[PDB]
Amino acid sequence: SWSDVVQWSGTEGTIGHDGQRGPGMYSVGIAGLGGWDDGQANSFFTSNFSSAPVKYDVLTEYKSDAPGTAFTRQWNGSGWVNPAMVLHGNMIVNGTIT
Amino acid sequence: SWSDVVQWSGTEGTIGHDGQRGPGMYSVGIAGLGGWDDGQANSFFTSNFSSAPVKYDVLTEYKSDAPGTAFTRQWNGSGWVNPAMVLHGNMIVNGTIT
Amino acid sequence: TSLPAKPLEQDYPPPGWSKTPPNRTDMTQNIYATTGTLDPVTNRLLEGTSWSDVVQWSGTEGTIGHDGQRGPGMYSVGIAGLGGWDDGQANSFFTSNF
């Protein structure tokens, strides 16, 4: 009888992976914000980016009704940590110019 | 004579597709803006991103000479629609703080 | 995963080899086949003849291609002690984050 059926021609390769997505100096607001929200930040990225945040990702969270209350954190690839030196144009919090 | 020429070795696969591009809370201005411009917004993405806008994409359009005139829309994957809750730090339009 | 060395043993099959093409559970690996003159009386290779040069016999997985490019945005970043546009700092920003 016929032998065991075996592949004879070439095989198409699978889908690989390419360069990672690039973040930006974003600025988003959350209603009723009293502090930095890791959950809201993660939800923002999951909803829009369709991918996890990447290394050195900077996102700014603030309460719009009182623009002084603003929080900025840097994603170092595993979580949100306080960045060493991040300075926005909206860094004027307590209405003071010296 | 020789038989019909047929492939004998493996075949390289084609190029697949990977995770989608991630948007951000962008803020762009258009000269002479009297309202939200779908065409200008699409031209902005086509020129810079080199790709179509993705789901939950937020872009802010404003007239720089009068910063109060600002418009923000969310791209829900098929068009620009009014977002449910988007609140920027520049949401102060009519010079009023209450 | 690579081209095996030519078998030296006259056994059918030689050590490390199988008479029938084994199932390719791992796609990255390839089925390599070599041929020789078999003696049915001894169930081994014919005296004075050996296995042919080892050649690929099954399909080959393709390499990783490239897809649509990353999309930028209307970003706004600050640098301490800035007296003018900094190409080096801008490039460092993109290399670190993007």
Author numbering:
A (entry chain A), B (entry chain A): 540 to 637
C (entry chain A): 491 to 588
Quoted passage from the original study:
The T5 family of viruses are tailed bacteriophages characterized by a long non-contractile tail. We present a composite map determined by electron cryo-microscopy (cryo-EM) at resolutions ranging between 2.9 Å to 4.9 Å of the entire T5-like phage particle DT57C, and atomic models comprising its core structural proteins. Our results provide a complete atomic structure of a T5-like phage, provide insights into the process of DNA ejection as well as a structural basis for the design of engineered phages and future mechanistic studies.
To obtain a reconstruction of the CFP region, we re-extracted particles after shifting the center of the reconstruction towards the capsid-distal region of the tail tip complex and performed a refinement with local angular searches. Even though the resulting reconstruction did not allow de novo building of the CFP protein due to the high flexibility of the region, it accommodated well a predicted structural model (see Methods section). The CFP trimer is connected to the TTHP with its own fibronectin domains. Being separated at the proximal part, the CFP monomers merge together as they extend away from the core of the tail tip complex, forming a straight fiber with high β-strand content in a 3-fold symmetric arrangement.
